[model samples]
Each structure stands twice: as structure tokens, then as C-alpha cells.
Target: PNQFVNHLSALKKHFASYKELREAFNDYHKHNGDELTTFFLHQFDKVMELVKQKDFKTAQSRCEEELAAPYLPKPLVSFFQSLLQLVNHDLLEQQNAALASLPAAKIIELVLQDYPNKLNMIHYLLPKTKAFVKPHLLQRLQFVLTDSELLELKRFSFFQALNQIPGFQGEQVEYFNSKLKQKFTLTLGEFEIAQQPDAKAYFEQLITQIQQLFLKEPVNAEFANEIIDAFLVSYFPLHPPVPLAQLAAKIYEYVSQIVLNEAVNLKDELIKLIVHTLYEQLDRPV
Candidate 1:
């Protein structure tokens, strides 16, 4: 109860805007994952109404009484009290400035590690230093958060953090295109190898080699297919002299035969290749 009181008091004191307060509440709920009780609902609504009326003192008093006290859990009270102490000590301003001074890489490292106060730190720093955020930093975030071990919420939160930066969407698209080009080049190399003399007889052998190359990395089948699709569209000429499409179609037919007959162990090699290219070559932190 003291903790909740402290925390809530600090947040109330630092309430610069309704949006800030709302985001703080949302962040609290996201971490807590508990539904508001009827008492809290009524109190919170009243507090919000007071805030809307610009009656901060009354709202603060109401929060102290209803949010910090009145049947709250022990841990919540303790948490609130700690926040209140920080607010009283004027620590938030110092913390905010400290966070603003940190580099994008450091902030990203905090987020990746699931820092307990990451949401607050991000909320404060985003508006102050968003201009410093770079595509390379965001790419690193995408790479780290896309790992299978990370939670979807964490990934979503990381994206929200990115969106706070100016031109993030445009930069993200540009980065994706650049990476796709890289993957296309890599996949095209394999196609060129398959186009060599005796390539028809060695078609399955080439596919096996491609599969092995990807297997050595962390590629996924979906990414591999994307690379393959891009390759097909880019490499196939609209008016080929020797019917390259027909030849490529024959190659796919052979692939289908091998799959049906279980002649090769290549399953989802394309996805793995794509994953590997994106992770290993294109998305590393700069």
C-alpha cells in the first residue's frame, strides 16, 4: 500500500499531460495484468474527472485516499510509497535527464534485458532524444526482439518505442528494402550456380548445396521462399530467347518429384535461408 501510494504520488506529481498520465496507467496495467476493482474504477474515474477540470490538488488527494489506501494489496502500497518518496526527493527529473543522455544502444540494451522500469525510461527519453534514433538501432532491436524466446508483448512494445521516433516508418521500409536486395543477390548466386553446364543433371545437387548452406545458419523457410519469389520475378525475363521460364519450371518440377519421392531432405530450406540472411547479414547492430 505504501509502495503504491509512493509510486502513484510520484506519477501524479509529474503529470505533465493527460496523455502522459494515460500512458503511465496503461503501462502499469500492462505489467500488472490485473483487472481494476469496482472501487478502483470509481476512484480512478473521479480522479480523471478532477484532472480534466484542472483540479490537480483534489485529484492528488483523492488518489492518495482511494488509490494508495482502501483495501489495496500490501505490495501495491509499498510500491506506491517508494514512488512517492522518489517524487518528493525530486529524483524523477534527475532520472529523466540521465536517461536522455544515454545512447540508443544502451537504451536498446535495457529494453532487450526486460529492465523493470524500461517503459518509464523509454517514455521519458523518447520525446527528448528521438532525433538521435537511427535505422541501425531499430534494426538491432528488430533482430534481437524477433528471437523465438522473446515475448510478443516485448516485441510490440519495442515497435511502439520505434514509432516514437521521427521518420521511423520510412527508415524501417528503406532498411527492409535494402536487406531484401541483399537476400536477392545471395539467392541469385545460387541460381547462377544452378544455371551452369550439366546444371540440369546436377539440379538436385545444387538444391542440396543451397539447403546445406542455409542449414549452417538460422534461416527460416518463409524467408527462403521470399528470396525465391523475388529471384523468380527478377531473374525470369519477359521475353527470353531460350525459354528460361520453361527451364526453371522444369527445375521446380524436379524439386516436386524429389519432395514427393523423399529423394532429398530439403524441408523449409528457403525459410531458413531468408531468416539467416536477415539476421546474420542484414540486421546486425551497427
Candidate 2:
């Protein structure tokens, strides 16, 4: 135990005490979740086991049980919170690779037109729903069923994407989803233009760095959001995007957070300059 903690101090000189780390992590896992949380719950040793085994994805998922946990020290809060943000970027990148990348129209066709028709054929005529037959659509139908599970895992991705719709009405979820689909189509057209040039690295950096806005300080002053939808739309076109307007708003708030926290003396110019740079990034060739 002493060696384990000493290694922590070696990794980061001012490490919080091992006990504090245990208290914070274990508390979050124990307190935070629905029914599944209760079952998956574990003490500090379990987290150590997962981390030691290099199971970052599951470890991070467990770490994400990140509740504020009463009166832990600010340093611990900052440490734990920062740990989640850093690890999450990696998990999001991995997730980004696997999520639905089909165009909005095709997904809608699957959900609205194809799934319904396929369900009838599979249920009534085919006897079972597997890829038993040689019909190409039937084979695809099985593949598409698996794809639906992928979508189900990130159900929040749908809701998060939907929040961007301006004209969303209370009575119309399907229609609203249609508008969300349409909006993704429009943004993809623009992203195609941006992608054509050599904008890849800088854009990737911002997408990675953008998660920092959810860092401890600014959110405390009353601003918060998980901006995955923006990147989702950027990378995956219509696959039911989490609209871009909300993305723009979060970036806008990030800039304001900078001004309120750090800058001064012609800070007005800085805001203009800051946004101008972002605008230029969007406009510049290569």
C-alpha cells in the first residue's frame, strides 16, 4: 500500500493522499446511479483493480459516477473532475469511431420505412429474424438490428441532439426528429467544405480541448453542458445529429468564461479578436 501510494506521488508530486483518493472515488460509485449503479457498485479496491488491468473504458465509466460527494477538498474535487475530463476525451474518441455514421435519410428510411416493413416480413413470413435466408435485405435487416442497439446505448445523444432545434414543438417528437434530421443534412454540407482543406489537426485539437470548459471553475459560476453533439454532427452527418446551434452557443459561452475569469484591459477587443480567430479558422483555406 505504501509503495502504491509512493508511486502516485512520483507520478504527480503533489498527489492527494491515497485515502482521500479512495474516499472520493468510492463515494461517487456508491452514491451515483439507478438500479444498475447498485449492482455495479464497488469500493476503492475495485477501481484500483480496473485501473491496474488497464481497463480504461470500464474504469472511466465507473469514474463517471462522479458526484460532488459532500465536502471533499477543492483540490480533490479539481483532481477527480480533471481526471474524468481527461479520460473522457479518449473514451469519446473511441465511441466516435463506432457510433452510427449513416446519413439522416437512410437512418430515417430504416427507422420509419424499412424497419416497419422488415418487422412484418421477419415476424410473419420468415419465421425467425436472423440471417438464415439469401435475401440481401434480410441480411441487412439483421445488421441493422444490431445498429439499433448502438443507437440505444447513446440514447442521450438523441436527446442532446434534439435540444438544438429552435422550432421544436411539444406535440411533435417524430416531426421534431425529422427537423433534427434535416438540420444535420444542412450542417454536413458545410462540414464537407471545412473538411476538404487541411483543417484536420487544429479542428481535432479544439474538439479535444473543448471539453475543458466543463472544468471546475466556470461551471461553478453557472454554465454547463456536455458538447458532444457538435462533434457528433461534425463527424457523422445526419445519423440523427445533436444539432450545431447548441454547439455554437457552448463555444460562445466558453469565450465569455475566459473574459469573466482571466482577461482585462481592452478585453472587449479580445472577445472580438477571439471570435474573429475562430471565424477565420472556419474560413481559412488549408
Candidate 3:
């Protein structure tokens, strides 16, 4: 009986509730023999009393503290930490209120439907926070999003956030550059359709393309400038008339002006100067 009591007590301590301990011991007694069953039945109330007296809250709290002590994983830790912050800010209540007002399936649908936009907002709001929603959560939401919804969610802000991360930025930049190149190719094709294309008009259109590229992704400014300079140098007559030489000089002068102007307005002024130079040289002797 003493041995049975000790074994049952140990089991009780190991488990969260009296019900669980009782069930486990019942199974063990059934498998082993009936010898312990009578003893277990006799002391069942005592085990219940012991379990009731135990401060399970402290034990549970300690277990939870230990579980949270180690680095769990990326994005899992990030999600919890971010959620904690939101809770502290009372944002969770607002979110809960908003969500609770909707039907359960509809709420799920909305979350899945707008996940990308929500991600973009989170990325923008928490730029330097270094926290993100869990990838699994995103994956689950993505499974629910339609293909067109997924396409629509590939937003500028999402990519902008991606651009700030180290290893990730390279692929995003490559993809973005490919898109820009494609756009430039299509624009060039359009320009080719013009009958009797003027040199000034061709250069103006090229400069406009470069400006559009810069506006779309300002991070590509250096690359855009490189393309613009390369095109300008390539198209300049190798051995030129005085007028063509003057036009090139004017382009260089404006380019220099943008470099020396307000740094914030550098790209804007560069586009303006290119357009101004192209137009200014329109009537010049070729």
C-alpha cells in the first residue's frame, strides 16, 4: 500500500490534473496486474485531495517561463513578440473587435483575402522593428488567397521591405530590374513605330524612360543614371558637326547642374535638365 501510494503520488505530481493521473494509473494497473488496483482505488480520494492542494498555477507558470527562455525560432519568436507589443498597445483589442464583428468564415476569408496588404502595412509600420508575422501563418493565408489575389499582393511596399533585408534583396532587385528592362524594351518598340524619328525626340524618349525607372524604384537611381549616361555617350556622334557637339555639351552641362543642385531633388532635376537640353537643341544645325 505504501509503495502503491508513493507511485500514485508521483504520477499525480507528473500530470496536470487528477483525471489524467487517474486514467494513466488505471491503464498501468490494467496492463501490469490487479494488485495495485485495490490500493489505487483506496487512495484515489487522497490523490484528488493532494492534487487540489498543489499550486498548479505556479508549476504551469514555471513551465511556460522555461519554454519561453530559449530562442524558439525565427518568425515564431518574432510573431509572439510582435503580438505582445500589439497587446501592450491595445491594438489587439481593436483587431479583436473588428474581427469579432464578422462571421468566422468571413473573417478567415478576409484575413486570407487581404493578407498581402496587411503584410505590407506591417512591413511599413515596423520597418526597423526586426519582427514579422510567422511564415506558416502567411503560408496558410496564402493557400486561401486566389492566384489573382496573390498577384495583386506583390506590392511595392512588400518588395521595398524585402529590399532592406540582406540575402533577400538580391533576388528582388534582379526581378525588379528585369521588369524595368522589359518596360524600357516595350517603350523603345513604341518609339520605333514613329515615322522619320528625330535624333532629339529619340533621346528625349530614352531620358523619359530613365526618369520613369527612377520614379518607380528610387533605389535604382545609380543604375538608371548609368544607363542614361551610356545611352548619351553611345548616341553622341563619334566625329561630330559643331551643332551635335554643342548639344552634347549642353547635356553634360545640365547633368552637372543636377549633381550640384539640391540632393533631394537630384533625380527630378536630372530629368528636367535632360528634357530642357533635348528641346533647346531641337532647331540647331545637325
Candidate 4:
């Protein structure tokens, strides 16, 4: 069996056909599932960025590269075609105001009427146009959808989706809903003061110890203050409720002081909590 070349060639010759290539392609896709998904999302982002910059030639070239790849998703082909229409129409309508006069509502209506299964397309297209339009156009579009369609527009993304709907009338409606359902049960103080299950029986043990301490009549107010300070040492051992930026400024100020020098270790979680609490949440500071 040292003479194997002729046998290998004969074996290869038996499977080298159109059906074999198709089977190989299917196997390749199955093996590279995660890689293919990553490639698609990355390419989508790159093409979207190009479109944002109005660099159609580069975008088209990159899109072609993906489309030429084996096992390309069919949805993307239709998605790209729809975007091409929007880009071309937008460019043309810059000069002709009348051409752009058709509202986004009309466009979404037509798309859904004809292609009901393509509901996911709205998720992609709405976000794309939200980045493209003016603040006033967004505001107007929000108004139109709220007033005419009876569709509730609350968040920025909700308004963004409406702005993409081609012929939406920009009017505000009595949009307040879910007032009671959005209520919070726990206060920040409650979160801080709750007793751990491990300490439940310890409180009863401490009551007997405190009664003996009271009978002895040994401790003064100064001793009581020390006990209070010791108790606080557990919970308040780390950072207080101060903002990190403010704490940093304070630390920087004290770092140079000779006698009053103090430095607090910053907890990363607390810093993040402070940031998100200060910036992200839409509520009055507690």
C-alpha cells in the first residue's frame, strides 16, 4: 500500500461533482454558524456607517462582497434594496420638496399591506432614519403619529420608529398611560436598613446582654457614642452617598493637606451606581 497516489485520485474522482459541492457548502455553513453571524452584523454596521457618510461607492462595494459570499441570507438582499430606494429618493428629494412630501405613515402602510411577514424590517429601518432626520422633523413626526394613528409614543426609540413611518401626521395626543403600573415598592432607606437572616437570633441574645449591661450601670454617653460608631462601622465602612466626581474633588483637595489628610478608596460598583443614578434615571434626586 506504499503506492497510494492512484488510489487517492480514484477516490477523489468519485465524489467530485455538483451535488458534492452543494453538500460541502451546507456543511461549511453549519460548522461556521457563529462566525457567519458575526460577519453579517459587522458588515451591516460598516455598510450603515458608509451610508451615514454618504459614501455610496465604498458601501456598495462592501455590500457586494457580502452578497457574493456563499449562503448569504435572502432577507439582506431585500433589505439593501429598500435602503437603496430610501437613499436615492432622499438624495433626489433634497432638490424637489414635493417628491419628499409623502409621509412615513404611507410608506409603512404600503410595506405592511404588501409584505406582512417583513415586520422586522421596521426595527432596522426606523433606527436608521432616526439618526438621519433633524430634531424638528423628529418632533413633528412624533406629533403626527401621536395625533393621527392612536399609537403611543413615549421613549426616544418609540418616537424614532414613528419618524420612519413615511406619512405620519406630527401631532401630540393625550399620551399619559401606565401611571400606576410603573410604581416602585422599595425605598433606598429600606434597601440599606434590612436585617440579614443570620442576625435574627443574635438580636434576642443582644437584648439579654444589654439588660445585664444596664444593671451594671457602667457605660457613659461617650461610651454609648463609641458603641454607635462601632455599629455604624459595619454598614458605613465603605463609600457614602456622595457622587464620585464630588468625592474625587474632595480627595484631590485633601491630598495636599498636611494635618487633615484623608483618602477614601473608591468602590467601582458604587461609582457606577452613582453615575447611573445621577445621569440615566429620570427622577428628582433623592
Candidate 5:
């Protein structure tokens, strides 16, 4: 009926995201299930799970698949299209944040300096740098990019708005293979890390732990797990897949020598508490 079709259209306009649509679909079913809306609702669950997990690409792909359905209803197609649009929007938003936050100049310095001769390294580096993929920032920033570097740049996406600086950016191969005839410039920029979680409490935990120890209170120790995790992630770039027990042991020994003085009794206790927490959290085997 025209009234029902108009209703579907109206509902579509009302919802902003896949989740919103899912909510409406639930409401619609509770009111009275339509064949078309129910079908679309069924497809939403898996995609919702993907979205919840922050697996936006998989959710986008699922929406794309639904849009391609041969016997799919027109409203369902519209629903999937909107869902795909939102998912792509999320993907774009996340990537842009990454591009904005990337430490591009530092990565470039390491890419060229550390593995200048290694294409294998460059391959690994490209994804790590996250520079050359879609929603390309290079095109926006017209730099004197070398062909070799251009190939890759056209390929990432870097730090504190490095492109904010005007000039050439490239790889190590360009330095030797081609003559350094043109002006060489590498710009460094600042960018903040995405989503610094609520760890202020743990910072307070650090001071409180120190207070408890230094004031000769009971053997109460609440470790700064969040703070330690941040430092470990920063210190070791590879994400540190395994436990930190060995590293924690090494850290404890390293701190022991420095905190051996009489006045540093509290510092030793703090270090031991931290190392023990590292062992407790990171050492668990699957």
C-alpha cells in the first residue's frame, strides 16, 4: 500500500545509523512485522555485532552483500545502502583520525634510515605508517615526492599534520639512485594519540601508593596497571603480543640497583608492586 511504503520511507529518514534502524525495526516488529522490514532486521544482527567489535570493514562488506541481493526489496536495498554509507563514514572517520595522529616524520626517518635498501621493510612500513591508503592526504598536499616515495605515498596515509609543512617527502632509495638535485625537505609535525582512556585514577593510584609506603602504612599496594600498560605500549612499538614477565623481572632488577639507598625504601616497594602487577597481568598463558 502507498501508505505503508510512505511509512517505510519516513522511517528510513528518521533513523541516522544502522543501529538506529535496528532499534526502529525492533519497534516496528513489536507494532506489527512487515515482510520487507523483518528481512532487513534479520540481516542487522551480524552486522551489529561487527559494528560493536569496531570491525567496520566487515560490517561494510556485509551491507554491500545485502545490497547486491537479487530478490531484495527496494526498501531493504535503501536500508543496506544507508547502512553501508554510515559504515564507510565510520571507516573514513577512524582513518582520518589515524592520519591526523600519525607520527609521519618519525616513521619516514626510520623507514629511510633504518631500511633504506629494503623493499621488504618498505612493504612492512607502508601499512605500519598507514599513509598511502584511500582518503589519500598526499594529493591534497602537493609535495616534491620522488617516484619511489610517490609510489608508496600514493600507496599511506602520518603525524602532527606533516603535510601542513610544504615540501618534498620520499624514501631512502631516491637519495642514492637519483641525484640530489632538488631541495630536500622532511617536515615533522605533532599529533595526539587517539582515545586516551580514563587512567587519571591510576595516576592517583601511583601517588597514593607512594603515600602509603612512605608514611609507613600497612603492606597495601595497588599497582598502576593502566600507566604501566601505556608506557610498555609506547616503549615497545610492536604491540607486545605476549606477557611482560621477563621484561618485568628485568625492570625490577634494573630498579633495584637504583632504589637500594635507605631514603628510597618506598621507591623499591613501588617498583616491586609495579613489576608484580606486570607479571600478574601479562604472564597469563592462553
Candidate 6:
């Protein structure tokens, strides 16, 4: 009870947005499982009402009362008590400010390990469930499948992992070349990356940035759009026959927009350097 009070108070202080607060509690519930009985329905109603009215103080107070109540299994009760303390500490740290930090991925991992079949079901049921539960459940599904299953799943695409990092396979590179032709309406020679030292370094750097941005989190529609946009503009330009100047421009433009806007002026400088190099390679009488 004491610990729960602390947790509730900390939650009130830390979370600036209602969505973030709701997701945190949803994560707590995800891990706690059935320890949260149907009796919570009453408290849930009151808390939700407070949340709707933006009465965060009352909502947190209700949460405290819910957490304080005793349960049959001492271990289970202790677990909830411990969660309350941990949440309290995190809240005091203002860790709750970012919804991103709430262990949405971790909870999803647990759910996948414990309840794989239920994942898709939850996705289907989300529209019908309370708004508070929707993000929590979706996060769980995304984390489990994308991080754990897709990487480890044994199948046709699994063997293709060898060619996953661009430029290794013969046909795949050709296909990429063809795709670029259609999108940019340029011939293969216009933007293709020669298997040259400088070009390889640039390609690897792009991959690194992508991995950094999306390593473990669930890939959502936003991320999908990012991937598609990158492919449309960046990847297609780097195939053979594509002019290095065009490739450099596309690459530099994306790197500037996606990554280094304020920290460094590398992208524009790189583009200029590549353009100069291409001009020199052409050896025009100037």
C-alpha cells in the first residue's frame, strides 16, 4: 500500500501526457497478468473516468487504492507491491515522460513467449477494447513478432539472410537496378554505385543509421513509410549504370533530412565533392 501510494504519486509527477500514463499502467498489467482480477473493473471505471476528464490526480489516487488491496497469493501480492515501488522510483526520475521508454517492447516479448497465438487475436480485438489497452496490446504484438519471430523464423526468406545486406547477390542487385529505372526514370548507368571503396563505405553507413534507428522496437506504419521512402529515393539510385552524381545527390539529401540537420554539414559537402569528382571524371574543357 505504501509503495503503491509512492508509485501513484510518482506517476502523477512524471507523465506529462495521458497516453503515456495509460501505456505504463498497461505494461504493469501485462506483466502482472491475472493478479489483476475483475474486481479491478470498478477501479478501472473510476480511473478511466478521471482520465477522460483529465483529472489525473483522482485517477492516480484510484490506482493507489487498487494497488494497495490484498490478494490471495502472497507472492503475487508481493510482485504487484514490487512493481509499485519500481514504478514509483521511475516516475520520480521523470522516466515516464517518454512513452517510448515504457517497456512496451519487453512486455510484447513476454507475451509472445507466453501467448503467441493470442497476439493476432489481440490485434483483431483492439478496436473493441478500451482505448487505454489498445497501444499496450499492439506494442506487445509488434515487439514479439518483429524482433523475435521474423529474425529466427525458419523458412524461405531465412536462407536469404546471406544477401540481406545489399550488394552481395547477383540477381537481387539487378532487380534493384530495374526498380530504380522505373521509379527515377533513369538508366542503370545514371545512379548505380560502382563496387568502389568510397561507395561501399557510404552504403554501409546508411545501413548503420537504419539499424540504429530501428534495432529492437516494433516496426509500425510510420517506420514502414520511412523504409519505403528510403528505398524509393536512396536505394534505387545506388545500382550500376546510375551516374554517381545522381546517386550522391539522392544519398546526401536523405542523410541530411533523416539524420544530420544540425549536428554537421557533411551531407551537402559530400554531395558537392561527388559532383566535383564526376565533373573532373568527365574531363570537359573548362
Give per-residue lDDT, candidate 6, residue 14: 24
Cα distance off (Å), candidate 5, residue 176: 45
Candidate 3 regions with alpha-carbon error over 4 angstroms: 1-89, 92-109, 112-134, 140-156, 159-286
Best by TM-score: 5
**TM-scores of all candidate predictions against the true structure:** 0.28, 0.23, 0.20, 0.22, 0.30, 0.19
CA displacement after TM-score superposition, residue 273 of candidate 4 (Å): 69
Per-candidate Cα lDDT values, in order, are 0.37, 0.33, 0.32, 0.34, 0.38, 0.33
Indicate whether candidate 2 or candidate 6 has the larger TM-score: 2
For candidate 6, give the lDDT of residue 143.
33
Global CA lDDT of candidate 5, please? 0.38
Tens-digit per-residue lDDT, 1-286, candidate 2? 0000001111111112335555665565566644433433333356557656757577565554542332233233334433443344334334443213443224334333443232211111111112222222222333332333323212223322222222221212211122133221122112211221223443344444444543555542222222222232223323222233444444546555565676443654444334333332231110
* Cα RMSD to the true fold for all candidates: 19.7, 18.2, 26.0, 26.8, 20.2, 21.4
For this target, which candidate reaches the highest lDDT against the unseen true structure? Answer: 5
Clashing pairs in 5: 102-159, 104-159, 130-157, 131-156, 131-157, 132-155, 132-156, 132-157, 160-190
Query: In candidate 2, which residue pairs get closer than 3 Å at backbone N, Cα or C atoms, i.e. clash?
Result: 161-242
Q: List, residue by residue over 1-286, the lDDT tens digit for candidate 1.
A: 1110122111112233345545565566567656553344445567667656755445545555653353665334433322222232222334345554567677657555544335334433343323555656655555533344433233333333344454243443111112222211111112212222332333333334444444544333223333333332222111112233343433343344444554233634433333332233321110
TM-score of 4: 0.22
Q: lDDT tens string, model 3, 1-286?
A: 0000001010011122235545665565566545434443334434344335553333333323322432232212222222222221233224445643443234344433545445422322222222332222333332322223333114222332333322221121211212112111111112111112354455555555545545655534434444343333322211112243333433444444455554233554445444433332221110
Model 6 is weakest, by summed lDDT over 10 consecutive residues, at 4-13
TM-score of 6: 0.19
True-vs-predicted CA distance for residue 25, candidate 2, Å: 17
- Minimum summed lDDT over a 10-residue window in model 1 is located at 1-10
- Return the candidate ranking by lDDT, descending: 5, 1, 4, 6, 2, 3
Q: How far does residue 84 in candidate 4 sit from its true spot (Å)? A: 3.3
Compose the digit string of candidate 4's lDDT tens values, residues 153-224.
122223323423332323222221121112111111121112233322233233334334444443322232
Residue-pair clashes per candidate, as listed? 29, 1, 0, 14, 9, 13
